[PDB]
Curated annotation (Swiss-Prot), chain B:
Gene3D superfamilies the record matches: 3.30.300.20, Ribosomal protein S3, C-terminal domain
Stated family: Belongs to the universal ribosomal protein uS3 family.
Source organism of the structure: Escherichia coli (strain K12)
The KH type-2 domain, residue ranges: 38-106
Any one GO MF annotation of this record: rRNA binding
One example of a Gene Ontology biological process annotation: cytoplasmic translation
One GO cellular component term: cytosolic small ribosomal subunit
Keywords annotated in UniProt: Ribonucleoprotein, Ribosomal protein, RNA-binding, rRNA-binding
Function: Binds the lower part of the 30S subunit head. Binds mRNA in the 70S ribosome, positioning it for translation.
Protein known as: Small ribosomal subunit protein uS3
SMART domains: KH
Subunit structure comment from the entry: Part of the 30S ribosomal subunit. Forms a tight complex with proteins uS10 and uS14. With proteins uS4 and uS5 encircles the mRNA as it enters the ribosome, which may play a role in mRNA helicase processivity. Some nascent polypeptide chains are able to cross-link to this protein in situ. In collided ribosomes contacts ribosome rescue factor SmrB.
Pfam families according to UniProt: KH_2 (PF07650), Ribosomal_S3_C (PF00189)
UniProtKB/Swiss-Prot annotation, chain E:
Role of this protein: Involved in the binding of tRNA to the ribosomes. Part of the processive rRNA transcription and antitermination complex (rrnTAC). The complex forms an RNA-chaperone ring around the RNA exit tunnel of RNA polymerase (RNAP). It supports rapid transcription and antitermination of rRNA operons, cotranscriptional rRNA folding, and annealing of distal rRNA regions to allow correct ribosome biogenesis. In complex with NusB is involved in the regulation of ribosomal RNA (rRNA) biosynthesis by transcriptional antitermination.
Protein name in the entry: Small ribosomal subunit protein uS10
Organism placement in taxonomy: Bacteria, Pseudomonadati, Pseudomonadota, Gammaproteobacteria, Enterobacterales
Family annotation (SUPFAM superfamilies): Ribosomal protein S10
Gene3D superfamilies for this protein: Ribosomal protein S10 domain (3.30.70.600)
Native source organism of the sequence: Escherichia coli (strain K12)
Curated annotation (Swiss-Prot), chain F:
Assigned keywords, A-Z: Ribonucleoprotein, Ribosomal protein
Name assigned to this protein: Small ribosomal subunit protein uS14
Known function: Binds 16S rRNA, required for the assembly of 30S particles and may also be responsible for determining the conformation of the 16S rRNA at the A site.
Quaternary structure annotation from Swiss-Prot or TrEMBL: Part of the 30S ribosomal subunit. Contacts proteins S3 and S10.
Organism name: Escherichia coli (strain K12)
Gene giving rise to this polypeptide: rpsN
GO cellular component: cytoplasm; cytosolic small ribosomal subunit; small ribosomal subunit
From Swiss-Prot, chain G:
Superkingdom of source: Bacteria
Protein's job: One of the primary rRNA binding proteins, it binds directly to 16S rRNA where it nucleates assembly of the head domain of the 30S subunit. Is located at the subunit interface close to the decoding center, where it has been shown to contact mRNA. Has been shown to contact tRNA in both the P and E sites; it probably blocks exit of the E site tRNA.
Keyword list, A-Z: Ribonucleoprotein, Ribosomal protein, RNA-binding, rRNA-binding, tRNA-binding
Molecular-function annotations in GO: mRNA binding; rRNA binding; structural constituent of ribosome; tRNA binding
Subunit structure: Part of the 30S ribosomal subunit. Contacts proteins S9 and S11. Cross-links to IF3 and the P and E site tRNAs.
GO cellular component terms given for this protein: cytoplasm; cytosol; cytosolic small ribosomal subunit; membrane; ribosome
Keyword tRNA-binding: yes
Miscellaneous section: The strain K12 sequence is shown. Has been predicted to contact the N-terminal domain of IF-3 based on footprint studies; exactly how IF-3 interacts with the 30S subunit is controversial.
Family designation: Belongs to the universal ribosomal protein uS7 family.
UniProt record, GO biological process: cytoplasmic translation; negative regulation of translation; ribosomal small subunit assembly; translation
Name listed for the protein in its UniProt record: Small ribosomal subunit protein uS7
RNA sequence: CCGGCCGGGAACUCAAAGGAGACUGCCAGUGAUAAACUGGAGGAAGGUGGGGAUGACGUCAAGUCAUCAUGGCCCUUACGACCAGGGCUACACACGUGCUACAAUGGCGCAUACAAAGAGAAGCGACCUCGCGAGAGCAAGCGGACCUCAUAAAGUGCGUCGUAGUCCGGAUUGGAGUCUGCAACUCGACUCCAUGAAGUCGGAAUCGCUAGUAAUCGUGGAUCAGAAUGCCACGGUGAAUAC
RNA sequence: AAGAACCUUACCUGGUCUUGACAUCCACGGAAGUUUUCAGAGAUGAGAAUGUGCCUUCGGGAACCGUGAGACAGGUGCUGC
């Protein structure tokens, strides 16, 4: 209810409330509810404080926000250190998967220069 | 020149296929190959013999080749001595054996391929196409052919620029599918280059 | 991400690298195979991979094993361009 | 004696039996309501019968196949119009006055080459 | 006992062969069901007309294939002999079965 | 029309039937999961020992006349233009223009 | 077309009662061929309306339509090369049709929550005829009047 | 054994072949008593019944010598032939064309139905078993009106999401896998976990389309070892406008 | 272009052969074919086992394969005005 960076949802349903944390989305949060037994429709505010206390170590079973941040950033830092073509595309800001740079992939390319 | 080929649209109508045989999807490919092969062989070997057309059939995994020709004697040779060889050679690519059935065209001047091959045999002799066309039209009308449209295109007696020319006579209802109209397109090699000869021949109303 | 069973190397490269290891590091290898996969034993080698115009020497480090030879020999060269800043 | 009609709306084929006495309608063992009569255009099949009496006077056993919902519904409609044949001109007077007797074939056209659904152009540009 | 299913391209070309085999059957003991017309397979085709580009212009084709069931019930010797090597019909593929 | 390419193609046809479809299981079965972990290494090593060709997937399946890779029809084997030229000449039974 | 004066298509009358007019409203509303849903929103709206008006659905719409019903409209014609609008009287057949188009127009405009809520709001505003449809009507009168001098 | 499942019937659909039917043929009026038109009737259908195929004279010295063929020219120890790797997919940009969007006539959850037309033997490959999943193991049946791809989806009902860049959207990226194929880095697709970009219905300008049409939904193919938002085809729902 | 991962490919780099990858002509040899090993990125290159079939003229042949000669082969090389 206060965990992570902040995690103070209100009016949100249990799964969408949990989604706010970096590193956890819909299906994982549904797995958390299938584990705790909590219903999807319950409000975060009406839900029992002790069930939140179980919720804390429950979602602590899966690494989330900052550790995942520094993990992914350390991975990208790794790719850059390898000098791999992928890491070069990470340095250019250009796509890595294989998207066409000739016209599209503007999103990863950033705003148009001229 | 992009206009529809008259035979193709009447193949289900008044123009039965020159090769009538069913096959399974597996061997149909190879049988078409062999068909093209025997048609080439018979085309080359009998070119001077003026064969008009070759009607392939393939009953019971064995080929039977009807042959419509202007001059059956020059095709058969002396008392059939060529025919047997033609059956052996063809049979080898035909899947074995090769039956053959000769047939003479009673009025060879009417038939298109014979006319075109004649006109090509004239063109190689440096004969003037302006005469050839009128000669073909003359024989067609003397036989009472209901219609005709001769056309040619190419260098035309050494002219540097290729040019088309034609001369129709009689009723020529290409749009009427009821119509009995033979047709051919045959290329004629010359010193200045290839000269296509197209020949429409309207034989009858049905 | 590919090859469920069996990491892939072309046999001539695994034999050249085998007798390259047992004989001590001396000179870069002339391999054209971008298709192979780095293995643990290949580390420390300066083996030159074909970028299509020539061979570029790459010094193999254990930090790169699961990867392949190709992507460390970038083929197409786009330098930067002409910036043409005004 | 039992009466019959067929009809066929948009590649679908209907088959319609009708008899005196009972008034209930049954289509493919399913209830008149549960199959289509609770969905919209429920009353259309009865629309010709609204001009006359229906309630207990006649019952229908219908089977249909092919097409979608509205296609099988119009097939039921054409099938009722064809099943009124025993009362022929007697019903065809007012019935044709209201139509429904019309085949109304209006089959879908085939896609034309280079045209997305037999008309649409590939967004022609001036240049 | 016997289930024959013959096939050919042209309907008009397969009809007289159907008449000849049904007649060959009637004279050989008959016990014939009555031939079934069957649905006709129609392979659609659409090939590019031009040697190069002209992507908008294509040419349609189809190859109708008519089929016919025969269905003779009797395992009569006269029947099985008549169904053997009297089929003829060039261009018409017969398929016997039991 | 690039005869060396057609002879190369048919050489892949002959040689390709000659090797695989016979020894092909060495990858088609053995490389698939089974109780032969040690052997599968020597298996794939023989797989690369085979020439780069012989595999059917390397067959572009060229036309039997012009040899053109594109516009091919597996149902015939002829290129679209040549099966159409044969069609208009009446070579292929029942290949009339369709209008429905 | 240049010549044909062919008439309108025959739409189906409303299943509960023979108001083909509102059936034409259901036509000018259907999107993506969702006929049954469009019809269901129509009945749901007419029910939500009639209970509040106290009137029967059809007549409650009749005294909403009549109020929003267009009088005259401007259209380009007889240009001097400088182009200017020509006001003219509407054909009665085009009258209620163009009115229902203005109803749907006002419906698509603005947002609240549900489309059934927007529709109910537009019909409610049409009941005491102070809505966006009479607004567009009086606006068309403003586009005229000063243009009405032309003839 | 409530499944046409099987006796049983060719009854009816369906399925094809082969015929009839619509021709301004009939009625009325108009029309120069002309042809012809308008209206009506019956009729399944009324005016070319609906659709499709079929491209005149010719033009553009249109495109194609790179389908093929061809007159000449040119190379013929290379302007020929074989192999490995690379590239044809490169990116400061601009244009054309398609797809998913920007949402609660909606999204999402459960339940619940209703098609047509194609394809399959070096192949289509049920069922069961395993796996959230893509798929794996085994594998009946099918040259097909039987069996398989192969459960249509939009829809229908209820349930919730309560108008925000939002349970919209799905881009991008990171990680974990599947299958194909020698080979998935360059440069496949698909799946799962994570991530949730721009975008609030789009200006000047501009396009298509008159009925089973536009709109919208999904299905199948050929190409093919694998890989469609493309192409070709199929059906489901289904408008408005014509002064 | 009814589907560029290799293949395709016409392209680039490098390694390769010059009667040639394929077709016809002749001499001079081997059946063809077969499985297996090494060097090489591979094609190629060097081997090793193995086979010696098909009518008669059985002194020959023919089919297939290899070396040699030149005539030729080949070209997605240019010219659609």
């Amino acid at each position: 209810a206060r965990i992570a960076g902040i995690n103070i949802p209100d009016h949100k349903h249990a799964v969408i409330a949990l989604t706010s944390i970096y590193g956890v989305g819909k299906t994982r949060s549904k797995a958390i509810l299938a584990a705790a037994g909590i219903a999807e429709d319950v409000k975060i505010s009406e839900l029992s404080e002790g069930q939140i206390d179980t919720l804390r170590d429950e979602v602590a079973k899966f690494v989330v926000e900052g550790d995942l941040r520094r993990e992914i950033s350390m991975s990208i830092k790794r790719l850059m250190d390898l000098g791999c073509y992928r890491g070069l595309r990470h340095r250019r800001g250009l796509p890595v998967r294989g998207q066409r740079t000739k016209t599209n992939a503007r999103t990863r390319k950033g705003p148009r220069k001229p | 020149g992009q206009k529809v080929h008259p035979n193709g649209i009447r193949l289900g109508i008044v123009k039965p296929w020159n090769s009538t045989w069913f096959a399974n999807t597996k061997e149909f490919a190879d049988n078409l190959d062999s068909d093209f092969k025997v048609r080439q062989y018979l085309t080359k070997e009998l070119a001077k013999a003026s064969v008009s057309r070759i009607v392939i059939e393939r009953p019971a995994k064995s080929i039977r080749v009807t042959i419509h020709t202007a001059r059956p004697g020059i095709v058969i040779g002396k008392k059939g001595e060529d025919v047997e060889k033609l059956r052996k050679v063809v049979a080898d690519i035909a899947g074995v054996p090769a039956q053959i059935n000769i047939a003479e065209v009673r009025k060879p001047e009417l038939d298109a391929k014979l006319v075109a091959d004649s006109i090509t045999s004239q063109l190689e002799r440096r004969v003037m196409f302006r005469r050839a066309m009128k000669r073909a039209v003359q024989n067609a009308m003397r036989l009472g052919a209901k219609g005709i449209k001769v056309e040619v295109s190419g260098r035309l007696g050494g002219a540097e620029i290729a040019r088309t020319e034609w001369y129709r006579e009689g009723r020529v209802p290409l749009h009427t599918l009821r119509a009995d109209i033979d047709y051919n397109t045959s290329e004629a090699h010359t010193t200045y280059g290839v000269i296509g000869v197209k020949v429409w021949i309207f034989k009858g109303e049905i | 991400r590919s090859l469920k069973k069996g990491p892939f190397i072309d046999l001539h490269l695994l034999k050249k690298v085998e007798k390259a290891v047992e004989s001590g590091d001396k000179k870069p290898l002339r391999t054209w195979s971008r298709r192979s996969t780095i293995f643990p034993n290949m580390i420390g080698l300066t083996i030159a991979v074909h970028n299509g115009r020539q061979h570029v020497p790459v010094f193999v480090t254990d930090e790169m094993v699961g990867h392949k030879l190709g992507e460390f020999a970038p083929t197409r060269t786009y330098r930067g361009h002409a910036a043409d800043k005004k | 004696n039992q009466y019959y009609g067929t009809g066929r709306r948009k590649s679908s084929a209907a088959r319609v039996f009708i008899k005196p006495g009972n008034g209930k309608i049954v289509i493919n063992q399913r209830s008149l309501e549960q199959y289509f009569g609770r969905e919209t255009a429920r009353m259309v099949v009865r629309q010709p019968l609204e001009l006359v009496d229906m309630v207990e006077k006649l019952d229908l056993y219908i089977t249909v196949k092919g097409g979608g919902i509205s296609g099988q519904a119009g097939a039921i409609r054409h099938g009722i119009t064809r099943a009124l044949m025993e009362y022929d001109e007697s019903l065809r007077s007012e019935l044709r006055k209201a139509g429904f007797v019309t085949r109304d074939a209006r089959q879908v056209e085939r896609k034309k080459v280079g045209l997305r659904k037999a008309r649409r152009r590939p967004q022609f540009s001036k240049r | 006992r016997i289930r024959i299913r013959l096939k050919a391209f042209d309907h008009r070309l397969i009809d007289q062969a159907t008449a000849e085999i049904v007649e060959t059957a009637k004279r050989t003991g008959a016990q014939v069901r009555g031939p079934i017309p069957l649905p006709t397979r129609k392979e659609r085709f659409t090939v590019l007309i031009s040697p190069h580009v002209n992507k908008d212009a294509r040419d349609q084709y189809e190859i109708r294939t008519h089929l016919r069931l025969v269905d003779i019930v009797e395992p009569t010797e006269k029947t099985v002999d008549a169904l053997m090597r009297l089929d003829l019909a060039a261009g018409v593929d017969v398929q016997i079965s039991l | 029309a690039k005869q060396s390419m057609k002879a190369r193609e048919v050489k892949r046809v002959a040689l390709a039937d000659k090797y695989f479809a016979k020894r092909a299981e060495l990858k088609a079965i053995i490389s698939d999961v089974n109780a032969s972990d040690e052997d599968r290494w020597n298996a794939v090593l023989k797989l690369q020992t085979l020439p780069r060709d012989s595999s059917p997937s390397r067959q572009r399946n060229r036309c039997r006349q012009t040899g053109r890779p594109h516009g091919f029809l597996r149902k015939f084997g002829l290129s679209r233009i040549k099966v159409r030229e044969a069609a208009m000449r009446g070579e292929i039974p029942g290949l009339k223009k369709a209008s429905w | 077309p240049r010549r044909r004066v062919i008439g309108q298509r025959k739409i189906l009358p409303d299943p509960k009662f023979g108001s083909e007019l509102l059936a034409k409203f259901v036509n000018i509303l259907m999107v993506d061929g969702k006929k049954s849903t469009a019809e269901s929103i129509v009945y749901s709206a007419l029910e939500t309306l009639a209970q509040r008006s106290g009137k029967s659905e059809l007549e409650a719409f009749e005294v909403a339509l009549e109020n929003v019903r267009p009088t005259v409209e401007v259209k380009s014609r007889r240009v001097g090369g400088s182009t200017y609008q020509v006001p003219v009287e509407v054909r009665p057949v085009r009258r209620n049709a163009l009115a229902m188009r203005w109803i749907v127009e006002a419906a698509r405009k603005r947002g609240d929550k549900s489309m059934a809520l927007r529709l109910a709001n537009e019909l409610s505003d049409a009941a005491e005829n102070k809505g966006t449809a009479v607004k567009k009507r009086e606006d068309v009168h403003r586009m005229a009047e000063a243009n009405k001098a032309f003839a």
